[PDB]
Amino acid sequence: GVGYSTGGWTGGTIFSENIVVTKNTRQFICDIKNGHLYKSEVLNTGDTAHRQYAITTPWSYFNFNQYSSHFSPNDWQHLVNDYERFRPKAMIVRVYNLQIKQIMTDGAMGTVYNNDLTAGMHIFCDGDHRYPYVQHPWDDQCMPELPNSIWELPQYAYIPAPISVVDNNTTNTVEEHLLKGVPLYMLENSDHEVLRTGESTEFTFNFGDCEWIENNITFSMPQMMYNPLVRSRRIYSYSGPNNQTSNAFQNAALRTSNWMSGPGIARGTHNATLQTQSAGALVTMVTNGADVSGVGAVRVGYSTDPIYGGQQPDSDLLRLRYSASAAEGQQNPILENAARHTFTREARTKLITGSNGADGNYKEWWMLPNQMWDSAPISRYNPIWVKVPRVNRKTLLDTQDGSIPMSHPPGTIFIKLARIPVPGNGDSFLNIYVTGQVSCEVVWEVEKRGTKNWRPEYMHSATNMSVDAYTINNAGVYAGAVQNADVMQTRFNHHKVL
Amino acid sequence: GVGYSTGGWTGGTIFSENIVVTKNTRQFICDIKNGHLYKSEVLNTGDTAHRQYAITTPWSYFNFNQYSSHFSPNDWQHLVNDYERFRPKAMIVRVYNLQIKQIMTDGAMGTVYNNDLTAGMHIFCDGDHRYPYVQHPWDDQCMPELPNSIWELPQYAYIPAPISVVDNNTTNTVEEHLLKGVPLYMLENSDHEVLRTGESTEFTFNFGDCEWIENNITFSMPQMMYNPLVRSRRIYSYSGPNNQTSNAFQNAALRTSNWMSGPGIARGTHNATLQTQSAGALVTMVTNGADVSGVGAVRVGYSTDPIYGGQQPDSDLLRLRYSASAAEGQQNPILENAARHTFTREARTKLITGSNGADGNYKEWWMLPNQMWDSAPISRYNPIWVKVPRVNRKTLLDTQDGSIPMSHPPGTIFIKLARIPVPGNGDSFLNIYVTGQVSCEVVWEVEKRGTKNWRPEYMHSATNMSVDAYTINNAGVYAGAVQNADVMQTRFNHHKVL
Amino acid sequence: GVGYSTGGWTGGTIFSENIVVTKNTRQFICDIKNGHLYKSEVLNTGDTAHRQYAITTPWSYFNFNQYSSHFSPNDWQHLVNDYERFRPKAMIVRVYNLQIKQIMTDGAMGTVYNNDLTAGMHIFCDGDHRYPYVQHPWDDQCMPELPNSIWELPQYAYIPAPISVVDNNTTNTVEEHLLKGVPLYMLENSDHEVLRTGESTEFTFNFGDCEWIENNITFSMPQMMYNPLVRSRRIYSYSGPNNQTSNAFQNAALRTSNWMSGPGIARGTHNATLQTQSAGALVTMVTNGADVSGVGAVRVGYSTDPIYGGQQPDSDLLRLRYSASAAEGQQNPILENAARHTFTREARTKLITGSNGADGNYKEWWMLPNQMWDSAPISRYNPIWVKVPRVNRKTLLDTQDGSIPMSHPPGTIFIKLARIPVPGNGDSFLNIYVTGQVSCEVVWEVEKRGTKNWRPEYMHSATNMSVDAYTINNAGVYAGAVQNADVMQTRFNHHKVL
Amino acid sequence: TKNWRPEYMHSATNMSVDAYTINNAGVYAGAVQNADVMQTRFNHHKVL
């Protein structure tokens, strides 16, 4: 059976008037995660750390949730420059050209690796989301930006419950009853495939009428939609001098609209020790009884950042910054938000208070009727989608991320080698690993749109990008975006009218 | 031929109004049992031990006779909570993804293992029961409760005759003539399969109109079926004061029925050294002549426990206790019987004797006409079936086990590696072993039933189960039921009327 | 709608070669039982009494479980004298000619009764046995033996649980957990009819292949089936004089058979205070934990009498005696068993012990293979059927009663007046009652059989019955059977061969 | 669900001894304590 290609190499991008197709293939690798066995572990223990409860599985998985993985920097450039809106339509993934080898470290020039035909590889796709979802936005280890760069699949693990609630089952009846109910998930529970070297498999996903990524900017606020030469009939009242009421007409080019800017909380900051404890501007803890005595919740609750939304944050360092990341050893931070070209995004509401004109700022602009704003921008390095949680109560939902929210996001494709046991049982097994190829073709629905704007428009040039931007250096090491110019932007480019 | 999946991984459970389907797959392993040769051995020699005569075979075998192996604890919960009766309908077993490797221990980093394509594996299914049956209730080594846990197949061996009868063939004409007739069974005697790595095989079994497992309890004894407000016409005689006979009518809410409780022997105890000698409340030895001088039969006969049946045992430690077991190194005992919710199960009959009311207890309630009772309970950890022996005389037959009795129980699937001999004959052979996957899909006929009972009913909650119950701990070690709460129960749940 | 017969009066009996049909109609009456409400009560409190836990319902019910109710004494005579076997085949019941009147006691010549057209009567038939069954053998208040005698329907009530187990819920965790689970049944739970005066309803039941009532006797024991002139070849061993073994042939007319007599316990007696506490030869208590400290079980368990079965009871007053009963104020006891004409019924087994001939009696003849005997007799006053409890374990089952056992016995027909509330609510209601007619036609499958016996046979004559037997006396008061002659018998009449 | 562990279930083993009953006067008692009422959001584990 072996000895046959069982696939090829797919790459490139094709642009059409209404569609774009990205084809990427990567060589992947997979170790024997864990002991071949599920483990209950406590991670992030630093004495003053957060310390979450987790289940670690013998499975590893593919994650495609990152634009950079599908578009070459050049492609992404034409995408953002030429199209006004776009969204993912369909994805087809293939796993093939599998090779499973066992590692024998003799001692003498050991680690010689030999093929093991007849050694199987499990591969399962959750599809319906029956197991805890992990494709969290911004996660590291996604399909590598550069083709020809190995993809080391990340091991699968999830958080069954907030560590704190069960912190003391012995010695607390509540934190104990809760602990009694903690769930447990294992994949062997469902049907899935097992492939020998001569085999392959394919998976296809269809984004529904998912949200569209709008790539446009205004220079005009919703409350600026009027004719400066025509006077409004409004006639407002105000406390005149001394004690009386007088009324007046704002002359033309001054008017009051029905629209307010986007909601959000512009204040707050980040924990200094965040790298070990919740760092979110928000923290949002829950304990149904429980204990959780004497800690900064910053060691109990879970962070959610950013928060400003349609408001201009009162201080920097609130800003959503990111790096291609994440391995220790030097990478450069960059912010998509750094360019600010649209005038529905960085709002600063104030109440009027006194008749002189003295204002009062709103560092917390809660939701109210008639608020209009544009979504946060994204860039080649942003994350494509976010699973919406299975809750029966949802609010307006704009992602601060810029990521496409969806109840049924691409399923997770898991894999793990067979647990080839061995005789002379001490509980051990054969040490093997897998390598193969993964191809992910994505069909993107694109839409081009024209304006009657006479003047030119901002365009990602690469004349304004770093000299490092997107390159290889004498060791075969690749450099992605090095500065905010490079990332490209959404809400950078096209002037709309409103 | 090799290099093809020749199977996949099947798992999960599906519930329907009248059916439930359990699908489990496990990775298995198999050594070269014995010398590759049959041996006549004497086991359990402890000087004061029982010491049985046995034939050990080069074969190993699969055993599926345990509920825990088919239902996940959660599944079993819904099964017992929601359905009133159920029974196995059909089983389909598959053996595939075979890999046969030979072990060379060089010395230098030895035990390197190499595949041996073209190395066959024998697999035979008795089906008709032509070879001594061994799927004895409660046996250890059955399909592992947790998927993803290796199944080490147990070697096959049986007891040709009670050791004692032949104990002295030389020096006793009877124990000798008997010995002359002892039989001998070997599997090479029948046709069976031989599979190379690229192959697989399947077996299907059909439980006939086998008995049903009833999951219900009463709170009402068969002799309590009457109206407390209506008087019975019976008019009994009794020895009145001094010397005369007078007669009377028990007023209403008092009555005498035709029904008696279930038979059984409530007395007796367990041998203290049982772990080496019959420990059964009963012992039941047979010797057609023979010798068998000067031993507690407890070293001759074979035990049969429990014995109380439809009676309440007069002392604890009669109770049928069990553990998932059985390897030495700490597991916890648990009893299914521990919950006692039905009022047909723990009976205590007494005869009246004297007219004052003085009773006489029956520690031995033998079989009599009109006895009504419910079968013993079972739990996820109980054994599914028991082969009924081929005898032409059978009694009423309720298993104290709770196991389903059947003349034609699932056949035994045996396997052993080919005896690859080697040149330079010193009688040796190539050291190889097998590993593969086994899938066992069972179709369970289920029946739901409703009551007119107004009040709520007992339900296995997991609010009442240990905090350990069913979990994994920092080493990838699994914990099943830790206390009697956890096992679930039969005769725990549903109120019937009678 | 009212003013129409909505029925007639059906009576008489018709005999055919293979069928007999009994038609009876009775005028019935029904009060408003309880407060119109269900009550949890403790009955039979006498300080030293049994004291059962019970639920009393606002419903009343019809019971037809008594031969005397269907056959006129004369009819029953021809039935037993002429037919050898018989059994109930089908029953059709009708409720009609309903009249509902309200009772106003003015004071002045009060209790004037006025019709209430538009006042409904609930009538429900359990049919499937969803509510606790109460047609217990020998119950008083069944369809009256004499037509033209009013039937006062007995109120419905049942025993949810043995009082003792819950005796102390406060102060005993076990007797408390049990109490938590006690069930509760109410009829409003199911659909049923509501009839105004102008209406009627009908119900039909079909006895399946229920057991047959055999009316025959032998004068020959199963171990007497041989030729006194032919010698048996058997040749038995016995301890001869001094110390040796000799063997011999029983000459002809002496033989040993394979048959033994019927099982049963011939000893024991009846409690002297039975009229308040279990009086059964047996008592059979069950307590799953519980308390039940310091009482003769005779105040805890439930009696089951008689017990001798196929054995001759060692003392009188064991004998199943009865009266048409049961209201206090003088009725005469009678026993069906008093005539003893068959020689399979009153057995007295003895073991031989010593070679001289010295026997040992078996006052407890438990069940054993090869036991042959005839069922207990019955009479016009015996009870027709007994519901077999819903248990999954049953023994041989001959009723000491003589009653036909059946899993699906005639359903119970319940009735209660509508709860006509009244304004000015103090929680009261209109006082009304119902009277109507009930007709019960039963089809009896009969079978006549002839013998080659030359001599005449015993026949219920009425030449051998009391002068009172079956009569009316100057007050319009009826007398049924006054002595054992009168009751007629089963196992009295026909000689069979075996 | 694919949850392996058991799940909370309204048992009536955890409900009052009064729960849902009739007492010597024909008076009915419904739920007497929070156990008895049953619950929604008590029972089934979902994934999100």
From Swiss-Prot, chain D:
A motif (Nuclear localization signal) lies at residues 1-9. It comes from the Viruses. Capsid proteins self-assembles to form an icosahedral capsid with a T=1 symmetry, about 26 nm in diameter, and consisting of 60 copies of three size variants of the capsid proteins, VP1, and VP3, which differ by the presence of an N-terminal extension in the minor protein VP1. The capsid has a channel at the 5-fold axis and there are densities extending the 5-fold axis into the interior of the capsid. The capsid encapsulates the genomic ssDNA. The N-terminus of Isoform Minor capsid protein VP1, VP1u, contains a phospholipase A2-like region. VP1u may play a role in the disruption of host tight junctions in the airway tract. A nuclear localization signal is present in the C-terminus and can be recognized by cellular nuclear import molecules. After assembly, it is hidden because it is on the inner capsid surface. Belongs to the parvoviridae capsid protein family. This is Minor capsid protein VP1. It comes from Bovine parvovirus 1.
